[PDB]
């Protein structure tokens, strides 16, 4: 007899009661998806030497437009040793360091060759046609990155670009938030393992395989607790191992006495809600357990396969993201058009769909595949349609009308 909890009350409750994990030191190569728990400062200047921007000649601006002797060429990886004297110039490339005595670089397009070398290619003398500006076409020391400058702020969710940035400044070790370890178990006497052949009155367990695969997609470590029989003893033993090995425990099915009893009386855990006004996902249950100053969270998902995966993306996924240090764990919601007419239900409805962009059409189309038992497309569902509850004015939606779609997969 648990009061009907609204979607908003349930969703906010999960986020508020979900704690943030501690910190650890990792290598920068494994920084993908991690959240910085420290500020990152550069210890060197970039570039460490004055470098040319264009292909041409490094010149002295004070000399002005005149005849110059080419004394040599600067190459990348080699610090120049020659000094540019008045009336002299040096061949330079886009990546080469600027030699001493030079204050400007003139590109080849503004020059004319006076003399070719009688043999073996090379350049001897050149005419400067343009009055060069002091510091023209030169990248000064520390132009891009200064010493002591903060290159990455605390709380930054690092991607491929951020990793390369770390490599540039020479920070190979960084402090990040820990990743949550999730344990998943299934309850039910009618459940068998996928590898087994069917027996009378038995079916194969599909929820466990799907739930684990979903969590793995977001990059979190998982633990398989296997199938647990529907009895008080086995639930206690299964949950005890889950708490000991993981921070998060997820169970599926068998809701409609033993599960909620052991959590309350035996485990002394705090059950927040047991029923939520939604379709599907009615018997969804969420509870927290505090042991040794550490908070463990437990998710009890419905037995229905569709109900399990829907509640997973709505409740479990945002919860997991908060623990790893993500500042905004709320999912991305976009606008799309309905592909088919739908009748509204008194409950808010959620069902998997496919987002497709057409030729120069500003809004994407959402194709309903949620009514399984089944549309066979070559593509997997990448969105979750979010239909509004039935009202006095709105009872039915028509094809083409704009609705909200929550992105749940890589587009």
């Amino acid at each position: 007899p648990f009061p009907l909890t609204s979607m908003d009350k349930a969703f906010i409750t999960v986020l508020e009661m979900t704690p943030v994990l501690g910190t650890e030191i990792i290598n920068y190569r494994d920084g993908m998806g991690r959240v910085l728990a420290q500020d990152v400062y550069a210890k060197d200047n970039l570039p460490p030497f004055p470098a040319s921007v264009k292909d041409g000649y490094a010149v002295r601006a004070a000399d002005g437009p005149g005849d110059r002797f080419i004394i040599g060429e600067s190459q990348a990886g080699e610090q120049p040793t020659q000094t540019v004297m008045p009336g002299q110039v040096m061949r330079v490339t886009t990546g080469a360091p600027i030699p001493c005595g030079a204050d400007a670089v003139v590109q080849v397009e503004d020059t004319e060759l006076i003399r070719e070398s009688d043999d073996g290619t090379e350049e001897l003398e050149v005419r400067i046609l343009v009055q060069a500006r002091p510091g023209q076409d030169i990248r000064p020391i520390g132009h891009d990155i200064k010493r002591g400058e903060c290159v990455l702020a605390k709380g930054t969710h690092m991607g491929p670009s951020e990793i390369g940035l770390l490599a540039t400044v020479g920070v190979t070790e960084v402090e990040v938030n820990k990743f949550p370890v999730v344990a998943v178990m299934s309850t039910g006497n009618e459940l068998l393992n996928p590898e087994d052949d069917l027996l009378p009155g038995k079916i194969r367990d599909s929820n466990r395989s799907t739930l684990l695969a979903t969590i793995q997609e977001h990059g979190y470590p998982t633990i398989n607790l296997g199938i647990v029989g529907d009895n008080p003893d086995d639930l206690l033993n299964a949950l005890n191992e889950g708490i000991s090995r993981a921070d998060v425990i997820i169970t599926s099915g068998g809701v409609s006495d033993y599960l909620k009893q052991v959590l309350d009386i035996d485990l002394h855990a705090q059950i927040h809600f047991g029923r939520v006004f939604m379709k599907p996902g009615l018997p969804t249950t969420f509870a927290t357990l505090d042991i040794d100053g550490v908070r463990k969270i437990i998710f009890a998902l419905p037995g229905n396969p569709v109900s399990a995966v829907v509640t997973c993306n709505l409740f479990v996924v945002p919860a997991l993201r908060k623990m790893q240090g993500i500042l905004d764990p709320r999912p991305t919601i976009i606008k799309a058009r309905l592909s088919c007419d739908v009748k509204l239900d008194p409950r808010p409805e959620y069902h998997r769909c496919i987002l497709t962009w057409h030729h120069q059409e500003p809004l994407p189309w959402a194709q309903s595949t949620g009514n399984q038992m089944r549309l066979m497309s070559m593509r997997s569902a990448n969105g979750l349609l979010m239909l509004p509850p039935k009202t006095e004015q709105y009872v039915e939606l028509h094809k083409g009308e704009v609705v909200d779609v929550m992105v749940i997969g890589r587009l």
Partner: peptide
């Protein structure tokens, strides 16, 4: 934001 979709004209 909100979990319920809702709509506009």
């Amino acid at each position: 934001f909100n979990i319920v979709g809702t709509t506009y004209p």
